[PDB]
Amino acid sequence: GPLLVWHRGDLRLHDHPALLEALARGPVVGLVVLDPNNLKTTPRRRAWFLENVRALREAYRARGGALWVLEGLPWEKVPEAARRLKAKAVYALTSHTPYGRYRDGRVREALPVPLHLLPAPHLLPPDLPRAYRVYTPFSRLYRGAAPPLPPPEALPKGPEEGEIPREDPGLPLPEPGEEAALAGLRAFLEAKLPRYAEERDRLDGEGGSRLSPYFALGVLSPRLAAWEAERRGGEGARKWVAELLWRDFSYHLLYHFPWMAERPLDPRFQAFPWQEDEALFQAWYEGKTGVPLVDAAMRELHATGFLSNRARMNAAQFAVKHLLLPWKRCEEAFRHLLLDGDRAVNLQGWQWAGGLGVDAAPYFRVFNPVLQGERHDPEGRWLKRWAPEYPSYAPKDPVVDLEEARRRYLRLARDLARG
Numbered sequence: 112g113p114l115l116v117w118h119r120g121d122l123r124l125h126d127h128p129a130l131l132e133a134l135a136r137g138p139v140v141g142l143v144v145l146d147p148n149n150l151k152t153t154p155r156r157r158a159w160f161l162e163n164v165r166a167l168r169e170a171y172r173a174r175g176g177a178l179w180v181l182e183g184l185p186w187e188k189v190p191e192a193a194r195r196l197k198a199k200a201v202y203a204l205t206s207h208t209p210y211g212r213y214r215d216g217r218v219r220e221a222l223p224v225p226l227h228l229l230p231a232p233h234l235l236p237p238d239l240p241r242a243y244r245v246y247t248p249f250s251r252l253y254r255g256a257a258p259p260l261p262p263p264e265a266l267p268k269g270p271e272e273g274e275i276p277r278e279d280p281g282l283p284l285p286e287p288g289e290e291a292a293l294a295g296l297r298a299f300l301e302a303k304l305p306r307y308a309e310e311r312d313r314l315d316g317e318g319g320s321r322l323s324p325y326f327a328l329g330v331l332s333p334r335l336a337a338w339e340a341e342r343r344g345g346e347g348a349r350k351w352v353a354e355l356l357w358r359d360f361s362y363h364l365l366y367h368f369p370w371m372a373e374r375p376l377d378p379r380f381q382a383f384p385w386q387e388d389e390a391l392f393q394a395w396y397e398g399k400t401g402v403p404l405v406d407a408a409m410r411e412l413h414a415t416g417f418l419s420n421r422a423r424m425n426a427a428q429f430a431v432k433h434l435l436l437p438w439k440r441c442e443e444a445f446r447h448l449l450l451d452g453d454r455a456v457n458l459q460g461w462q463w464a465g466g467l468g469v470d471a472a473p474y475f476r477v478f479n480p481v482l483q484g485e486r487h488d489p490e491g492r493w494l495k496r497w498a499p500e501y502p503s504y505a506p507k508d509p510v511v512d513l514e515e516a517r518r519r520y521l522r523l524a525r526d527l528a529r530g
């Protein structure tokens with residue numbers, strides 16, 4: 112009987128510990144389960160996942176191999192596939208998330224054959240004994256990527272079952288699949304890496320790799336990416352790998368501090384008097400704040416499903432600090448709009464930008480939204496693409512008074528954080 116390789120957020124054949132572990136023991140059949148716990152989300156994100164499952168199937172077929180795709184609860188469908196295939200055992204990459212642990216425990220209960228979970232490739236794993244709140248001490252544990260595992264060359268024949276629905280994303284998707292991902296990585300490392308340190312804070316995000324949507328679904332291994340960048344080397348190289356490490360730091364943080372999905376990491380801010388306000392929330396959410404940078408950022412996000420780091424930190428902080436909007440609502444709304452939307456990473460970014468205790472970033476740093484545009488969109492080209500409404504970064508009729516908002520936040524904040 113075959114071994115089942117169950118792909119979850121790891122829609123690739125390269126650097127895939129579970130796939131090779133299984134192949135070394137016998138013939139394999141792969142499986143994806145379309146799980147409503149993950150797929151009951153926005154069309155853009157469902158489609159991005161589905162189209163990558165479709166690409167993974169194409170990759171299996173091109174190698175002569177068989178990828179099943181079933182729809183439903185994993186603890187019903189994984190056992191179903193095991194029974195139908197007469198599988199000897201199921202292999203998958205460990206998941207340390209509360210849902211991943213819940214689901215995998217339930218699957219192990221329902222399976223009458225072993226479930227073998229292998230460590231997912233990381234630069235640093237999320238479940239180290241020690242709990243860092245600060246990126247620098249965490250980052251020093253990393254000493255360069257281990258080598259990635261090869262993809263299989265050809266795959267053993269097996270039966271294929273199951274359909275992959277076609278859904279409307281509502282917008283243009285990147286090219287799905289690991290072949291497009293690896294091409295994009297190779298091009299970034301050639302063209303852009305040298306100036307990455309100098310260009311990564313552009314509001315247009317064009318100094319970066321734009322590989323997040325692949326990372327978020329495991330279509331590209333972070334180990335492979337760090338490994339390739341380190342073989343390329345140069346100055347941008349250390350700095351770009353540092354950013355891959357912020358991804359791992361985000362998993363580390365949600366792992367050691369799970370409660371941060373409920374409340375600020377900094378207990379000093381847990382009683383901050385946020386102001387619910389529907390009209391205000393909608394103005395932010397729809398990019399109608401009258402603040403050029405924020406409005407351009409939120410309008411690109413709706414239209415495209417992507418935003419540069421520098422745009423994200425400005426859009427997110429603005430809601431929290433200038434508008435005082437409850438962070439949980441905004442956080443979630445923001446994730447639902449992102450192709451690369453990744454709960455742990457988005458939470459990290461929000462708690463960092465909002466000054467809620469990640470990396471002990473200080474409350475007093477408040478983005479001046481006009482300086483930020485002047486400094487990170489030099490000739491206004493990015494503003495002109497995304498809200499040509501506005502002839503400069505000067506607020507035209509802002510939903511709040513901006514200097515008062517700044518004064519009010521800092522007052523409030525410098526007043527919880529002391530005492």
Ligand SMILES: Cc1cc2nc3c(=O)[nH]c(=O)nc-3n(C[C@H](O)[C@H](O)[C@H](O)COP(=O)(O)OP(=O)(O)OC[C@H]3O[C@@H](n4cnc5c(N)ncnc54)[C@H](O)[C@@H]3O)c2cc1C
Binds near residue numbers: 311
């Ligand atoms: C409020 C906020 C919310 C965010 N939400 C998400 C999210 O849901 N999903 C997501 O993938 N990223 C999120 N980011 C992190 C980061 O902005 C994006 O990963 C980045 O813009 C991706 O662009 P890139 O692929 O060109 O990155 P590059 O600059 O080329 O970096 C390479 C890779 O490193 C990782 N990375 C880069 N910056 C960060 C960072 N600040 N934190 C963690 N990992 C990083 C990503 O995997 C990225 O693709 C968020 C950031 C903020 C400030």
Ligand SMILES: Cc1cc2nc3c(=O)[nH]c(=O)nc-3n(C[C@H](O)[C@H](O)[C@H](O)COP(=O)(O)O)c2cc1C
Binds near residue numbers: 143145146149
């Ligand atoms: C938009 C999106 C859709 C996803 N859909 C699935 C899916 O249907 N099946 C699955 O096994 N993994 C899916 N994943 C990867 C999972 O999130 C993965 O199961 C992970 O190991 C545990 O889920 P979690 O992120 O909620 O903790 C999806 C990821 C994202 C970002």
Ligand SMILES: [Cl-]
Binds near residue numbers: 226227228
């Ligand atoms: Cl085991």
